[PDB]
């Protein structure tokens, strides 16, 4: 388990514990007031904010930098942009496409069916067959 799910589970446990402790403390401020005939803040607060900050850091450490594998090659060669999101300018989007050896137009470029029939008739002849 990496940091994000760890921080989710820890945040859930801490927040439930702080909620139960505040339930107990605020229940015996009215019951105890009634027992007197109508007559633990700091640590609880700090625990609650600790749980909140844990949750926020658990929501933020769920973002991993994008890392790829090349379509053509077979070694690892992780092609990392060092980004968290995807660019909106078409230049950089097609850039991150081109660093991988693929083409998003795909079928229009390769025309898969015709070269498919030609190559699968070809593949019988070659040496690996």
């Amino acid at each position: 388990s990496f940091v994000s799910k760890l921080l989710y589970t820890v945040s859930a446990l801490v927040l439930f514990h702080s909620g139960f402790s505040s339930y107990e403390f605020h229940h015996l401020l009215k019951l105890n007031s009634l027992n007197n005939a109508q007559g633990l803040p700091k640590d609880i607060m700090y625990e609650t904010y600790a749980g909140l900050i844990l949750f926020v850091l658990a929501v933020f450490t769920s973002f991993e930098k994008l890392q790829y594998l090349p379509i053509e090659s077979n070694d690892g060669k992780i092609i990392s942009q060092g980004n968290y999101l995807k660019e909106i300018a078409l230049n950089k989007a097609t850039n991150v496409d081109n660093l991988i050896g693929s083409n998003p137009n795909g079928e229009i470029i390769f025309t898969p069916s015709f070269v498919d029939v030609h190559m699968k008739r070809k593949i019988c002849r070659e040496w690996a067959s």
């Binding site: 139960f20 009634l34 027992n35 109508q38 700091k42």
Partner: protein, 694 residues
């Protein structure tokens, strides 16, 4: 809504008084007639099953005991001033005959003579003898106390009644004890309520985590897991103790007797203390701590009693400074521990008892002659003013303004304008009944200075022989009297007080920094609106209910002549009402503006004492005790018969229900869960695999 808790919550005790005469019944041989509870004008004639308890019926006859004698049976009762007489059947209270000229006859009820006939007591032991051949069958050891043998029947349904202590009666049969009765509670004068209830930072983190986790671990086992999660499945004692329903009611009888009654468990007696004061007049808590009582006696003594969980102890008895008969006692300011004592002969004594181990004070006394008022200065009392009635007038009803928690400062109208109800604390209301004009006048006196500020007279031939009463609310007054002219029926009248009747005005009550001075007389004066309603039955007395915060409607509660108790919410008694023709599409009226409806019919749902007889005596008190669970308030009737119950004027909205449908809700949730879980694969597979046509 009633039948679940019909007899469960109602708390009625039957008191027959100390028995004066026990007359056998000629038919149904195990039955007797008991004349008891004498007074100057009436007595209590009851029927009693002698082989059990189980009082059969009771009636308050308006004759003294010496005027009630048998025939020459038929129980002839004859007045002495006139010769009005009534012959009543035994074994059924049928008025067999009535007349004015001559009584048929009488025989004096015979004395017991049970010695020389059937009884001999020598060695602290009671022997029953045959008249002849005194073989002494059925001997019995005497009880600790022993006064006399009340009743004794020797034939086949053998029954014996012993008056064991001064107020206790023991009943034996052929000898084994069969029943036991106690009438120590025959007349309650004053009450008091006793309540029963429960009972660096990293180290804080560790102790809290360890105790919580160990608490979870211990309860982890004992499926039972789902029922522990349910929290539905129960003992009602913790529920009653949590809401404040359970209480101890401390009552002082007319003779000297303090006792504690369990407000739950149908009034089992927790403890009884016997004083020797020979009459009790008042009872107070000595301090806010609610541990000690001070008890005033008729002859002038005062007692200090230590209330404990066990039987109390009478820690002190001593006389007052002046040994005269005590009429009444007023509690002065709590912290100064003062009391003002009014002796008959009308003499006032300031009293400062103990620590319990210009700031003027004003008092107000009322008599049938008028309202008097006093000022307490420098530990002395001084007469301040007087409002005395004429020779032919007589004050009949009087009431003070009860202190009330302030929730809302004004009643708000439709179109969101507010009337700014009149809230001035030092007010009293009273009724003057005048012969020589046959009128009833209502007055709303300002008690610090003595201004009248309202007078309102009715001339509709009031009767003056039927009971009259008044109650004073937060900002309204309601009084009741009988009258003949419109129809011969009981009548209620309600007046409501406002600072000004124009829909948005504070003509006065400048609240910023003014620091009002009431003794000068500078205060603002009220305006009022009044209505009258007709009620079927004669209302003996009235009260208004109390809660922890005075939010729910006040529920004017009435004790009728029958003994039945009925309340009506203050919403029904609406001044400013309209006849329900002018309420339609009147945007200005209110939220949920109730109509006028002058004729009020009796509603059998609200009649508390569903089937209880509840003969409450001539001198009785209606009291209301607040509780938690603010929808509910306790009401009790003290007198000859002591009774207690709970009412909810606005419905029960705090506690959810005893008839909640949990199973239907869980069935709905489970149906939704399974239908989702079954329809999900169908939609997923079908639509996702068909829309892409793979």
């Amino acid at each position: 809504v009633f039948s679940d808790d019909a007899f469960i919550t109602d708390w009625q005790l039957a008191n027959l008084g100390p028995w004066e005469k026990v007359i056998p019944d000629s038919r149904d041989r195990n039955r007797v007639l008991i004349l008891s509870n004498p007074t100057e004008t009436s007595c209590l004639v009851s029927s009693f099953n002698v082989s059990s308890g189980q009082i059969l019926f009771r009636n308050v006859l308006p004759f003294t005991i010496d005027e009630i004698q048998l025939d020459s049976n038929a129980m002839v009762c004859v007045n002495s001033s006139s010769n009005h007489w009534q012959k009543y059947d035994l074994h059924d209270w049928f008025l067999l005959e009535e007349g004015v000229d001559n009584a048929p006859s009488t025989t004096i009820l015979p004395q017991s003579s049970y010695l020389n006939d059937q009884v001999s007591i020598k060695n602290n032991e009671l022997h029953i003898l045959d008249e002849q051949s005194k073989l002494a069958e059925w001997k019995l050891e005497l009880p600790q106390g022993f006064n006399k043998v009340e009743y004794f029947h020797r034939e086949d349904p053998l029954a014996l009644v012993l008056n064991v202590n001064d107020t206790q009666y023991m009943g034996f049969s052929a000898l084994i004890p069969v029943w036991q009765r106690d009438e120590w509670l025959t007349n309650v004068v004053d009450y008091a309520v006793l309540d029963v209830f429960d009972s660096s930072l990293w180290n804080a983190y560790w102790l809290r985590l360890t105790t919580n986790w160990n608490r979870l671990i211990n309860l982890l086992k004992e499926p039972g897991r789902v029922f522990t999660k349910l929290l539905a499945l129960k003992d009602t004692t913790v529920s009653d103790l949590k809401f404040g329903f359970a209480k101890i009611l401390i009552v002082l009888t007319h003779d000297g007797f303090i006792g504690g009654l369990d407000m739950v468990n149908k009034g089992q007696l927790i403890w009884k203390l016997d004083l020797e004061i020979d009459q009790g007049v008042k009872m107070f808590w000595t301090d806010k701590n609610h541990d000690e009582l001070v008890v005033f006696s008729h002859d002038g003594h005062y007692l200090t009693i230590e209330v404990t969980k066990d039987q109390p102890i009478i820690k002190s008895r001593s006389p007052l400074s002046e040994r005269k008969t005590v009429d009444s006692v007023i509690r002065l300011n709590e912290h100064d521990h003062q009391y003002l004592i009014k002796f008959e002969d009308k003499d006032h004594l300031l009293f400062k008892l103990n620590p319990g181990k210009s700031s003027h004070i004003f008092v107000t006394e009322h008599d049938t002659n008028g309202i008097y008022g006093y000022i307490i200065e420098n530990d002395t009392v001084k007469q301040t003013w007087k409002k005395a009635v004429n020779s032919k007038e007589k004050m009949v009803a009087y009431s003070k303004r009860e202190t009330t928690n302030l929730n809302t400062l004004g009643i708000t109208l439709g179109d969101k304008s507010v009337l700014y109800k009149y809230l001035y604390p030092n007010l009293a209301a009273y009724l003057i009944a005048n012969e020589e004009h046959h009128t009833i006048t209502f007055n709303l006196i300002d008690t610090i200075t003595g201004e009248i500020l309202i007078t309102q007279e009715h001339k509709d031939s009031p009767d003056f022989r039927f009971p009259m009463d008044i109650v004073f609310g937060e900002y309204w007054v309601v009084y009741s009297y009988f009258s003949s002219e419109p129809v011969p029926e009981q009548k209620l009248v309600v007046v409501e007080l406002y600072e000004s009747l124009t829909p948005d005005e504070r003509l006065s009550n400048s609240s910023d920094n003014f620091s009002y001075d009431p003794l000068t007389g500078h205060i603002n004066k009220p305006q009022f609106q009044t209505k009258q309603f007709i009620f079927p039955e004669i209302i003996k007395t009235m009260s208004i209910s109390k809660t922890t915060d005075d939010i729910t409607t006040k529920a004017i509660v009435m004790e009728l002549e029958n003994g039945q108790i009925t309340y009506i919410p203050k919403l029904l008694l609406n001044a400013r009402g309209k006849p329900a023709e002018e309420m339609a599409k009147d945007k200005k009226k209110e939220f949920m503006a109730t109509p006028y409806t002058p004729v009020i019919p009796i509603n059998d749902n609200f009649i508390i004492t569903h089937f209880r007889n509840l003969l409450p005596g001539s001198d009785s008190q209606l009291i209301s005790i607040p509780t938690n669970l603010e929808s509910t308030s306790i009401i009790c009737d003290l007198g000859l018969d002591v009774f207690c119950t709970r009412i909810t004027p606005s419905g029960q909205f705090d506690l959810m229900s005893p008839t909640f449908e949990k199973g239907k809700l869980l069935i709905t949730i489970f149906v939704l869960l399974v239908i989702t879980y079954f329809i999900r694969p169908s939609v997923s597979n079908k639509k996702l695999k068909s829309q892409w046509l793979i």
